[PDB]
Backbone as JSON, one array per atom type, in Angstrom:
{
  "sequence": "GAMGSTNVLIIEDEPLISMQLEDLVRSLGHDIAGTAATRTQAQEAVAKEKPGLVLADIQLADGSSGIDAVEDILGQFDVPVIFITAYPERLLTGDRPEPTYLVTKPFQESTVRTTISQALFFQNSPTAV",
  "N": [[13.38, -12.19, 8.24], [10.78, -14.42, 8.41], [9.21, -15.53, 6.75], [10.32, -14.79, 4.34], [11.68, -12.18, 2.66], [9.4, -10.27, 1.86], [8.16, -8.58, -0.79], [7.04, -5.44, -1.76], [4.63, -3.33, -3.22], [4.97, 0.03, -4.11], [2.76, 2.63, -4.14], [3.29, 5.86, -4.7], [3.49, 9.16, -5.5], [5.27, 10.87, -4.51], [8.69, 11.41, -4.19], [10.15, 11.48, -1.94], [8.67, 10.44, -0.02], [8.07, 7.87, -1.1], [10.67, 6.65, -1.19], [11.3, 6.75, 1.39], [9.35, 5.15, 2.59], [10.23, 2.8, 1.17], [12.9, 2.03, 2.32], [11.98, 1.94, 4.98], [10.17, -0.43, 4.9], [12.06, -2.16, 4.02], [13.84, -2.1, 6.17], [12.27, -3.46, 7.95], [12.76, -5.84, 6.94], [12.0, -6.52, 4.47], [11.02, -6.19, 0.83], [11.17, -4.34, -2.57], [9.12, -4.3, -4.58], [8.42, -2.9, -6.76], [7.96, 0.47, -7.83], [5.48, 3.0, -7.93], [4.24, 5.84, -9.26], [1.85, 6.47, -10.54], [-1.19, 5.12, -11.19], [-1.2, 3.51, -13.62], [1.46, 2.88, -13.65], [1.55, 1.42, -11.46], [-0.05, -0.89, -12.58], [1.84, -1.83, -14.16], [4.08, -2.22, -12.72], [2.88, -4.51, -11.27], [2.37, -6.14, -13.51], [5.0, -6.9, -14.09], [5.94, -8.08, -11.55], [4.5, -9.83, -8.85], [3.65, -8.33, -5.93], [3.9, -8.99, -2.37], [2.62, -7.53, -0.56], [0.94, -4.47, -0.44], [1.05, -0.67, -1.15], [-0.33, 2.32, -0.7], [-1.09, 5.77, -1.85], [-3.52, 8.19, -2.12], [-3.79, 10.53, -3.85], [-2.24, 10.48, -7.16], [0.32, 10.96, -9.29], [-0.67, 10.91, -11.87], [-2.99, 11.92, -11.43], [-4.92, 9.98, -10.93], [-6.59, 7.89, -8.56], [-5.11, 6.45, -5.98], [-6.66, 4.31, -4.59], [-8.15, 3.17, -6.31], [-6.18, 2.43, -7.92], [-5.26, 0.54, -6.13], [-7.51, -1.4, -6.07], [-7.41, -2.43, -8.43], [-5.22, -3.91, -8.48], [-6.1, -5.72, -6.62], [-8.03, -6.81, -8.18], [-6.41, -8.66, -9.4], [-5.04, -9.97, -7.71], [-5.21, -11.42, -4.08], [-4.33, -9.77, -1.78], [-2.48, -8.27, 1.03], [-3.26, -4.71, 1.85], [-2.06, -1.6, 2.56], [-3.22, 1.71, 3.29], [-1.57, 4.47, 3.17], [-2.04, 7.66, 3.51], [-2.97, 11.33, 3.13], [-5.58, 11.77, 3.05], [-7.56, 10.6, 4.82], [-10.17, 10.69, 5.41], [-11.27, 10.75, 2.85], [-11.5, 8.29, 2.34], [-13.78, 7.55, 3.45], [-16.23, 8.57, 2.51], [-18.85, 8.09, 2.1], [-18.17, 5.81, 1.25], [-18.77, 3.44, 2.32], [-17.74, 0.66, 3.01], [-14.57, 0.26, 4.91], [-11.29, 0.8, 4.6], [-9.13, -1.77, 5.28], [-6.52, -1.49, 6.2], [-5.2, 1.48, 7.58], [-3.03, 4.33, 7.49], [-2.25, 7.76, 8.35], [-0.78, 10.41, 6.47], [1.36, 12.91, 7.63], [3.13, 10.13, 8.48], [3.97, 7.96, 11.14], [6.97, 6.02, 11.93], [6.69, 4.0, 13.62], [3.92, 3.31, 13.73], [3.62, 2.27, 11.11], [5.59, 0.3, 10.58], [4.25, -1.25, 12.5], [1.77, -1.6, 11.43], [2.34, -2.91, 8.79], [3.35, -5.45, 10.0], [0.94, -6.28, 11.11], [-0.66, -6.46, 8.68], [0.48, -8.5, 7.57], [0.48, -10.63, 9.17], [-2.36, -11.31, 9.42], [-2.52, -12.97, 7.13], [-3.76, -13.16, 3.93], [-5.53, -15.66, 3.0], [-8.03, -17.02, 3.33], [-11.45, -16.65, 1.67], [-12.63, -13.59, 1.76], [-15.26, -11.68, 1.67]],
  "CA": [[11.94, -12.45, 7.9], [10.42, -15.94, 8.55], [8.32, -15.8, 5.69], [11.09, -14.59, 3.55], [11.71, -10.87, 2.28], [8.01, -10.08, 1.18], [8.12, -7.69, -1.84], [5.92, -4.44, -1.46], [4.29, -2.42, -3.88], [4.76, 1.43, -3.19], [2.27, 3.53, -5.0], [3.4, 7.27, -4.13], [4.22, 9.99, -6.39], [6.26, 12.05, -3.83], [9.56, 10.44, -4.16], [10.98, 11.48, -0.47], [7.85, 9.6, 0.73], [8.39, 6.39, -1.73], [11.9, 5.9, -0.72], [11.2, 6.6, 2.99], [8.51, 3.71, 2.78], [11.04, 1.64, 1.05], [14.01, 2.11, 3.61], [11.15, 1.43, 6.26], [9.81, -1.83, 4.57], [13.3, -2.55, 3.99], [14.23, -2.18, 7.53], [11.66, -4.71, 8.11], [13.25, -6.99, 6.25], [11.25, -6.77, 3.15], [11.89, -5.94, -0.39], [10.34, -3.56, -3.22], [8.46, -5.07, -5.91], [8.21, -1.93, -7.69], [7.57, 1.8, -7.33], [4.38, 3.7, -9.0], [3.59, 7.17, -9.25], [0.55, 6.48, -11.12], [-2.11, 3.95, -11.5], [-0.69, 2.86, -14.85], [2.79, 2.42, -13.31], [1.0, 0.12, -10.77], [-0.13, -2.15, -13.03], [3.1, -2.22, -14.85], [4.67, -2.93, -11.52], [2.29, -5.89, -11.0], [2.45, -6.89, -14.73], [6.37, -7.55, -13.92], [6.18, -8.99, -10.32], [3.5, -9.82, -7.98], [3.72, -8.05, -4.54], [3.01, -9.61, -1.49], [2.21, -6.49, 0.24], [0.6, -3.31, -1.32], [1.09, 0.45, -0.24], [-0.73, 3.36, -1.79], [-1.57, 7.02, -1.39], [-4.95, 8.7, -2.47], [-3.35, 11.27, -5.0], [-1.29, 10.17, -7.75], [1.03, 11.96, -10.09], [-1.24, 10.91, -13.13], [-4.42, 12.43, -11.08], [-5.71, 8.85, -10.57], [-6.83, 7.68, -7.2], [-4.45, 5.07, -5.42], [-7.5, 3.39, -4.15], [-8.52, 2.55, -7.72], [-4.95, 1.41, -8.38], [-5.47, -0.84, -5.33], [-8.53, -2.32, -6.5], [-6.93, -2.97, -9.77], [-4.17, -4.99, -8.16], [-7.05, -6.64, -6.09], [-8.88, -7.64, -9.29], [-5.78, -9.47, -10.02], [-4.82, -10.83, -6.61], [-6.04, -11.26, -3.09], [-3.21, -9.41, -1.31], [-2.66, -7.33, 1.9], [-3.02, -3.39, 1.28], [-2.05, -0.54, 3.46], [-3.68, 2.87, 2.88], [-1.07, 5.39, 3.7], [-2.51, 8.86, 2.79], [-3.18, 12.6, 3.98], [-6.93, 11.88, 3.01], [-8.28, 9.19, 5.7], [-11.58, 10.9, 5.35], [-11.74, 10.53, 1.48], [-11.91, 6.91, 2.0], [-14.84, 7.34, 4.4], [-17.06, 9.5, 1.9], [-20.03, 7.33, 1.73], [-18.08, 4.65, 0.33], [-19.22, 2.36, 2.99], [-16.64, -0.36, 3.47], [-13.54, 0.97, 5.3], [-9.83, 0.2, 4.35], [-8.27, -2.68, 6.14], [-5.29, -0.73, 6.94], [-4.9, 2.85, 7.4], [-2.31, 5.27, 8.07], [-2.14, 8.96, 7.69], [0.31, 11.24, 6.26], [2.69, 12.27, 7.76], [3.06, 8.87, 9.44], [5.03, 7.53, 12.25], [7.37, 4.63, 11.23], [6.4, 3.03, 14.59], [2.63, 2.69, 13.39], [3.91, 1.81, 9.77], [5.96, -1.03, 11.06], [3.3, -2.14, 13.17], [0.76, -1.95, 10.33], [2.88, -3.94, 8.15], [3.17, -6.77, 10.65], [-0.51, -6.65, 11.19], [-1.27, -6.94, 7.46], [1.21, -9.69, 7.31], [-0.11, -11.29, 10.4], [-3.43, -11.91, 8.82], [-2.1, -13.41, 5.64], [-4.89, -13.21, 3.04], [-5.41, -17.21, 2.84], [-9.64, -17.04, 3.4], [-12.01, -15.87, 0.61], [-13.3, -12.53, 2.19], [-16.38, -10.89, 0.83]],
  "C": [[12.11, -13.84, 8.12], [9.65, -16.39, 7.43], [8.97, -15.36, 4.33], [10.89, -12.88, 3.3], [10.38, -10.69, 1.24], [8.22, -8.73, 0.61], [6.92, -6.66, -1.8], [5.86, -3.68, -2.5], [4.18, -1.09, -3.45], [4.11, 2.23, -4.28], [2.15, 4.95, -4.44], [4.2, 7.84, -5.37], [5.2, 10.88, -5.88], [7.16, 11.1, -3.6], [10.33, 10.24, -2.59], [9.95, 10.44, 0.34], [7.99, 7.98, 0.39], [9.75, 5.95, -0.9], [12.06, 5.72, 0.6], [10.4, 5.22, 3.35], [9.52, 2.22, 2.35], [12.28, 1.22, 1.91], [13.07, 1.55, 4.74], [10.82, 0.17, 6.07], [11.0, -2.45, 4.59], [13.9, -3.07, 5.49], [13.44, -3.29, 8.4], [11.95, -6.12, 7.85], [12.77, -7.74, 4.98], [11.69, -6.25, 1.89], [10.93, -4.8, -1.2], [10.09, -4.08, -4.4], [8.33, -4.21, -7.01], [7.68, -0.46, -6.93], [6.58, 2.51, -8.27], [3.8, 5.0, -8.43], [2.06, 7.41, -9.68], [-0.24, 5.15, -11.0], [-1.58, 2.97, -12.63], [0.67, 2.24, -14.53], [2.83, 1.31, -12.37], [0.95, -0.75, -11.52], [0.97, -2.67, -13.8], [3.75, -3.12, -14.11], [4.15, -4.7, -11.46], [2.47, -6.69, -12.3], [4.05, -7.54, -14.81], [6.45, -8.36, -12.72], [5.02, -8.62, -9.54], [4.0, -9.34, -6.44], [3.02, -8.63, -3.45], [2.38, -8.92, -0.42], [2.11, -5.38, -1.0], [0.38, -2.05, -0.58], [0.45, 1.45, -1.32], [-1.33, 4.49, -1.12], [-2.79, 7.3, -2.09], [-4.45, 9.48, -3.72], [-2.06, 10.74, -5.68], [-0.74, 11.14, -8.58], [-0.2, 11.94, -11.45], [-2.88, 11.79, -12.89], [-5.08, 11.28, -10.68], [-5.59, 8.61, -9.33], [-6.09, 6.36, -6.79], [-5.34, 4.2, -4.99], [-7.78, 2.6, -5.26], [-7.11, 1.64, -8.23], [-5.01, 0.22, -7.43], [-6.21, -1.58, -5.83], [-8.22, -3.19, -7.67], [-6.16, -4.23, -9.5], [-5.19, -6.08, -7.33], [-7.75, -7.27, -6.81], [-7.91, -8.59, -9.73], [-5.22, -10.4, -8.99], [-5.43, -10.58, -5.39], [-4.64, -10.96, -2.05], [-3.24, -8.29, -0.14], [-2.56, -5.78, 1.53], [-3.19, -2.55, 2.32], [-2.39, 0.73, 2.89], [-2.65, 3.86, 3.35], [-1.23, 6.96, 2.94], [-2.76, 9.82, 3.76], [-4.76, 12.72, 3.96], [-7.53, 10.8, 3.62], [-9.64, 9.55, 5.26], [-12.2, 10.72, 4.01], [-12.15, 8.87, 1.2], [-13.27, 6.56, 2.85], [-15.95, 8.42, 3.96], [-18.28, 8.95, 1.33], [-19.78, 6.25, 1.11], [-18.44, 3.49, 0.87], [-18.09, 1.44, 3.8], [-15.41, 0.67, 4.03], [-12.32, 0.05, 5.25], [-9.25, -0.51, 5.63], [-7.27, -2.22, 6.94], [-4.86, 0.49, 6.7], [-3.95, 3.63, 7.98], [-2.37, 6.68, 7.37], [-1.02, 9.51, 7.54], [0.09, 12.36, 7.14], [2.48, 11.11, 8.82], [4.18, 8.54, 10.22], [5.46, 6.35, 11.89], [7.09, 3.61, 12.53], [5.11, 2.5, 14.21], [2.74, 2.12, 12.07], [4.55, 0.37, 9.97], [5.16, -1.94, 11.8], [2.1, -2.41, 12.16], [1.09, -3.28, 9.37], [2.98, -5.45, 8.53], [1.9, -7.27, 10.94], [-1.09, -7.31, 9.79], [-0.77, -8.45, 7.13], [1.14, -10.7, 8.36], [-1.27, -12.29, 9.97], [-3.19, -12.05, 7.44], [-3.6, -13.55, 5.18], [-4.99, -14.87, 2.52], [-7.19, -17.31, 2.72], [-9.99, -16.3, 2.07], [-13.08, -15.0, 1.46], [-14.23, -11.79, 1.26], [-16.4, -9.38, 1.04]]
}
């Protein structure tokens, strides 16, 4: 990495997907800031360490929405978030704004590696509305 190993927050209840994302993002030369199966664990992760990139699904273990977890984090930081989930359509349910980065489950590592590189290309420096 040129900007250093950017630690990533992975919000995913499914362990096989979490560790997949962990290894995947690790292959990209990044790190893991924490793993969260729930929105609560997500906030605790953040309470511990600030991630430079966030990953979240829709359905969490607690029944909470990963989007809400993301927005919570976004209420703390202005960091790039990538939504990888089996419910792309759920983010398009009259919500109006569309997720900046979206990948559908099951994902292709090629797409994921691509998406991370984009999210971290457009580093969140300006103040977007």
